[PDB]
Write a protein that binds this ligand. Sequence first.
Ligand SMILES: Nc1ncnc2c1ncn2[C@@H]1O[C@@H](COP(=O)(O)OP(=O)(O)O)[C@@H](O)[C@H]1O
Lengths: 48, 70, 42, 65
Amino acid sequence: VDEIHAGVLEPTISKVKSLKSALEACVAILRIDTMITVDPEPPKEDPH
Amino acid sequence: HIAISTNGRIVPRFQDLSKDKLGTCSRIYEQEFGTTKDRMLIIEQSKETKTVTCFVRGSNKMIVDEAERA
Amino acid sequence: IIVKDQGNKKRQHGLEAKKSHILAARSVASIIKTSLGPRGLD
Amino acid sequence: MDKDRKDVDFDLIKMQGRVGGSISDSKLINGVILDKDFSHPQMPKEGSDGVKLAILTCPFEPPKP
Ligand SMILES: Nc1ncnc2c1ncn2[C@@H]1O[C@@H](COP(=O)(O)OP(=O)(O)O)[C@@H](O)[C@H]1O
């Protein structure tokens, strides 16, 4: 059914800012091929 | 940096605050539009020369610390 | 001139302890080799 | 370094990034930018119509020794 004939309507801005950022996120991860993940700082747990 | 930019000399102590060290400019900007609502102070324009600045933008903060790197 | 008599090596640790880093170093510059040129990745 | 000839050059250029937006949003500023926000209604702001700045220095509180 024709949407304009209906109350339904979303601001153009929303359909843009969301379409655009959805891409950058995607891209940024595409460029990824290796994730070096170094451990944090452990408790001293010193035997001495 | 702030000095050589806005052409305004630094003012130390209270007695001196003279009309000499005034930074001859035409407009100060404090905008908050565009995601995110967070704002940044923009200053233009100053008669002096030799200082240039650029504001980076990107989501996740990953793209900032990388567009900056790039 | 050179012949049979001479003359051993006093220690061999030198040799291998050199072939060591040559590797440990290589590996780094190896797994990083993917981010060179326009078709490199982060 | 233009009209100054070739030289070893250190960057006085300042690039500050706001986490909001996409790559393209970023732009050169014809002037200066500062990370610190205004005084906000602390307090009463930008931008004084025509402006005249001041690099005020030292304390500003009630005269204390
Ligand atoms: N048009 C091109 N086609 C293929 N490779 C290129 C091209 N332009 C530059 N490169 C390669 O990429 C460069 C090296 O970049 P480098 O600082 O080592 O890491 P990165 O590639 O991530 O910037 C070049 O010197 C070159 O070997």
